[PDB]
């Protein structure tokens, strides 16, 4: 298999919920263990954005999540917010590559900062300590000074950075091609297998 | 009237190509004054991703965008990208607000380092040291550290950067509402009315 | 009208309770809609140095201000702190000044490092991204180099840093002298006609 | 009226008399209310340069500048390098922009480090606080990298650094049209109509 | 004795004179001695706000200073501005703690460049180089990033910046309520007694 | 002979063709070589600001301004913007001095950032690592922080920075006496003889 | 001749007047021309630290010190503080070199800061923008990061910080041996010739 | 008794081996305990400078040095350079306060990086960790930027840099009065009671 066999993704409270729940599903259609975390406030966006009804609490949010997805019993871990028994909140856990998606610009502060106010904040603080793939997908606009600054430090670190910016070159038609767009290049950013966005020139050879 | 009565409009070759003819359009039906700029990337982007077929050369250029607008005889102005005697190339000008929609990375590059290599970078060039609205719409994902730099140095003098990342808050439909959030977003920033993207929580009183 | 129709007016738990209550009575009486918000940290301040007996609730509290200031039905809305459906949470609203009366030293942490997490946090976040105005007001001594660096870098964005620092300029004779100084700064500085500071030298000529 | 009801005028001791002298004149033709003031230096450069005998004192200076204007009673106030009765000394004074024209080296430095050692430098950091136009016209050449910084840094916190370095593209034919260029580009930066620099390419439409 | 056996008090421009006699005395009563210093402009400030005439030449001041106060013949030394003969001029001088209060604008940018034009200004860079207590009592709203970087350099040296931003958290009654806040602090940064503002919660044990 | 015996003269696309032919002519009159280098931009500022009619091409360029300026055969060499084979190219060259005279903020960024895009670029680049004389012109106004910055960089390495910024202080009277100002100027940074500006000073010897 | 014809040598308050009187009679020696300049602080340390009866005013200073030293008629210029006349006060002077010796920390700062508040202060900021050669000779210890900056910057831009560090490796047996020793220093790093310290190694060929 | 009771005295290979002398003396006579640590380099330059035939071995170095200063058996230890079991080379040892006198521009380096190569250089960085007296006295002219910046680096941690740069205010008659200038500044930074140097203006009363 190409890619981590293990993701952490964890929904911050940016717009763009299709984004996380999309990603969700290709992880899961790609057989990859998912570590699911989600804030307060990505609910709250969830709940205005999509008609997914989530449950609230990690037992019942884990078994919505398996059946909305088509996992494995197992598959999909969900982790609640305080949960420090959990594998992201240790560097001594066994390696995941790390997404956030959509990632707020609180979550991008409290990442640069190293706040750690939460499990998903104390995720990337390990991921970033241990060298391990932590992508942040931002959506804001216009972006300020501070958030340039944070993405900025976080970026020199070598977190990748991944707006959610789709690109238009492929044509596409509806909402959902260019979720797949941001999506994809989440996938391609992660060496995990995506049949959504073709390798640009592949088949160009010359001119 | 609220707003500029002025705006510059500079294409350059990111993919989003949609945005700035979007862009174009509302400032037209706006009765704004539109001072057109497109770099050859740009032009090739638009043949790539719409089926909007631009001439070439600025005179045959200028009577296709009046007519696919509805503007009015003299209200989008075409400067091609060498043209000094051009408004934006001198601040003696009379003011205007500028866009970039999309801002290619090289563009972005270049308003950042002050290049002022064609008509465009001349002209944020121009914004920047007559303290006139600029406003930045950079299209690319994922953003690298230099990318990021350029970024937060221009909006530490006073740019907007205003990135093309829609939100989802507004229950987006189609691919148009995405990009009419994107513009919405730009002709708030202006100060130009614009009745796409409401006003957030303006109904709302407590709670 | 001089000066905007509308303030964000947030109190968070820094000594000076006096402040952000004589502000609010004089946005009232100059007939501008104010969104209040006020920190778990304030309203502990507020009852620990007056004897305004503010209610906890949004609703409640809402009444009793109007009351209390002998405002206009629905001219004082007030949001709670966790309320993103209130205008303050996203650059999509209707454009407002936003002044933070008090301010505590962690409030003024949180807005220089984009922390976010609460209304009013998100709320100057949201200012700083549309360059819409940002009153800062302070109150600590000694200032940490902490504390000034936090200060500096919004300073160097365009927020405006204003200490509660009264001046003794035009002969004080009581605490509220004082107080209404620097509410007459704040107001000067937001543009908004104030008859308790008059206009140093006007009537001076020459020497 | 566009622009500014009240402009304070600082004359540092840098060669170019010639520039503040114009300046104040059209300033007065627009029926704008000057705050005028003076360096040592700068009566010293005004001596050598021009042929205008300038009282020393203000009261004479002022009767003085009010006849050679051609002023109303009133409309040039001049104001002594200690008195901080005058209203440039507080931001608690009537708004004015303020331009420093021609702007020495030393007064430069001043204006950048916050030293306020008389009233044209505190006058000046008044407007940076309060955030007030601030336009500083130096004359001097090399520029070294001490002078480079101070610009810089003012630059940086929205001071306009407008150098002394006219412009030749309508085709001056004596010193007065090369004065006349740097005044009209600080009258454009002010917001205040002048009619000695065209709108550049305001004719222009296409090519 | 706790505290400094001597105290270097300068008084200089900034409005707030009413701390720095209020200071005076409170030293007078700890029977400290108090090498006084007071800048021109401040002497204009403490005849604007106040109704002490103080005389203007060195001998004539130190004698209405020791009357003023009650202070033994000695305890108050008085020197002129540019008296390089006084012990603060020199870091072979006996250890001395010092204080600005109030710190104008400019005597901060002064202390912070390194200027020592006069001796209140040589003296804090003395205390600077010998690693004495220096204490920076500022008056100024809005603070400029000017004022905020002079401030911040400072104290990452070990200065204590202490603006005159009196706390309302034991009810004050009265203007001299506030200034003896503001003046229990510096006596608390000295290590001076004072019994005009209690230690917080130091009766509280649980909670 | 005092200076240099070679000079490269880059003339590119700022306002102020005048300073760039004086020199020139000043230049072949103290009987140097001049390396003569010309951007496309400065071929229409030439055309548009002056009545010389300067041939396009480097041959037919090279015999005009023989005769224009009554030099020698060989003595003005003109080499094309791509000409790599030219002395100025390489570092191996015999040593000139080099002044962008004018010098475009176009040129002024390429020069800072290293750019190397045609031979002025490359030339200046290779006069910075050889530590051979690099002299900038620039002429704009206002200057922005781009502008600032880019210069800043340049003088700390060695290269100077002389604005086109004449002096008044030797009673101009045309615009000749002004551009031979600034000419003078350079030559005097040269260490190139010139009798247009006196030694300021030079017989004074008291007071 | 070696080194340069002229020598701006400027006294400042700092003590060690004797380097700076012995450099005089070096200088003179030498035959060179010498601008001499001193502050009314370095005054009062000659007047301290030596029996030199320097008189107060530059005619009768000019003619003292010429007796003093055994200088030709016209060898020493003395110029006052505010006499912008002279050469030094303008680039366009007949080159000099300018040694500050004593440097105080005061001068330090303003040439570090570029406040040009005397002829001393001009004629550094002079010495730093036309390249000419700058020789600081500080005496004070400690050195705060105040100082150490200050010299820092000016060392980084290419004056040389020379302190008043004599050394001990010539055996010296009196303070005259000990003021040689770092006029000889000075004199070295003008490039005039001088016989009070030895080439340091010049005869020692191999081990 | 005021001041440390221990001192760790280090001698490198600065010209002025004098001041160390000079120090180690006084120390002794102060009663305190000197942990004494000497480089190579400074033997050589001891040896070069004076007539002290200082023996190379611990052992016979601390008998030798005993005599030289008539110190008690056991006041003064002797340390070689890379004896870790002497208690300069922990923090856990009991607290000194250390002192580099002459400190080589070598040794500044080393301690400004944190280099620790001998036991000099790592009892720096141990007492820079702990917080305890650091001071340095560097020789050396001119100082070089990358002199100054180590000195800066330290000074802005704490460390006193007190260059040997003698005063001459107190009329120094020998060499050995300069070098008691020094040493006094040192004795008077660790708070040791010394009679060498008085205290400036203890005795000045007024003007
Ligand atoms: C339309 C509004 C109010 C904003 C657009 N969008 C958003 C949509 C919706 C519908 C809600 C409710 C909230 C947001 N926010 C704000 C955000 O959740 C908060 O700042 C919050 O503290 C984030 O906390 P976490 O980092 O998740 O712990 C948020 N934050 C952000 O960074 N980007 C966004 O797109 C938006
Ligand atoms: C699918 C490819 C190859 C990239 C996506 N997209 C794009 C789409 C298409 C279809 C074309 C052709 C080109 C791009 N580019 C590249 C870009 O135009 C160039 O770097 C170019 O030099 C820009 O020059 P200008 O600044 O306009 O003068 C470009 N640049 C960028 O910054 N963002 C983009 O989205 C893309
Ligand atoms: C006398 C005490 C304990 C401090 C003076 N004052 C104050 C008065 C009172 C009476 C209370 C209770 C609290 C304060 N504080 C502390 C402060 O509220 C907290 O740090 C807190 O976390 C702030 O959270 P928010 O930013 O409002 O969300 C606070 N914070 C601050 O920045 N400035 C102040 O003046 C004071
Ligand atoms: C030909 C000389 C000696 C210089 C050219 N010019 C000038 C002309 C004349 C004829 C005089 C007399 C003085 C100058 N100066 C120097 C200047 O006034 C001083 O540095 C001075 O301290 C400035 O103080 P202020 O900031 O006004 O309080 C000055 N300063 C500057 O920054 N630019 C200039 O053009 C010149
Ligand atoms: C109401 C005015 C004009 C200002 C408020 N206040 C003040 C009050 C009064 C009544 C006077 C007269 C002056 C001030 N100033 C200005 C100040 O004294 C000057 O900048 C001055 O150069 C300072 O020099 P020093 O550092 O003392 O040598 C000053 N400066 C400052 O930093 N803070 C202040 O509060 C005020
Ligand atoms: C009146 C206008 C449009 C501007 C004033 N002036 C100027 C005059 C004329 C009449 C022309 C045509 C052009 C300019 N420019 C713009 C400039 O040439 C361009 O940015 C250009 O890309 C420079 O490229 P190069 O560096 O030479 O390769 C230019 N650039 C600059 O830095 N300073 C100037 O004074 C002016
Ligand atoms: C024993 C005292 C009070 C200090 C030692 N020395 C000195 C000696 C004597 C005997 C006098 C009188 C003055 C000093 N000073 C202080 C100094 O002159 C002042 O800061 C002053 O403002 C300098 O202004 P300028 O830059 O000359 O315009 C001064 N300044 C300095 O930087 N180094 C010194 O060695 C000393
Ligand atoms: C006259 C010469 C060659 C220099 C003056 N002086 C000195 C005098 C004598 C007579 C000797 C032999 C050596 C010096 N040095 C050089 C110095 O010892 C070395 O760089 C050395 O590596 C220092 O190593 P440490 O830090 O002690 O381990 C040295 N180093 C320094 O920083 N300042 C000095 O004054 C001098
Ligand atoms: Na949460
Ligand atoms: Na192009
Ligand atoms: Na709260
Ligand atoms: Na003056
Ligand atoms: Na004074
Ligand atoms: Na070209
Ligand atoms: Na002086
Ligand atoms: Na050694």
Known sequence: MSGPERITLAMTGASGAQYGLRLLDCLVQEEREVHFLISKAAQLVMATETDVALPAKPQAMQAFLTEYCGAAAGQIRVFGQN?????????????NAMVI????????????????????????????????????????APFSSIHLENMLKLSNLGAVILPAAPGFFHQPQSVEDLVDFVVARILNTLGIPQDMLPRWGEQHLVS
């Open 101 to 140: 998606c959509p990632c707020s610009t609180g979550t991008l502060s409290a990442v640069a900062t190293g706040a750690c106010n939460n499990l998903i904040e104390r995720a990337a603080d390990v991921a970033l300590k241990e060298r391990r793939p932590l992508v942040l997908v931002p959506r804001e």
């Open 83 to 95: 949960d420090w028994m959990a594998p992201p909140a240790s560097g001594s856990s066994a390696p």
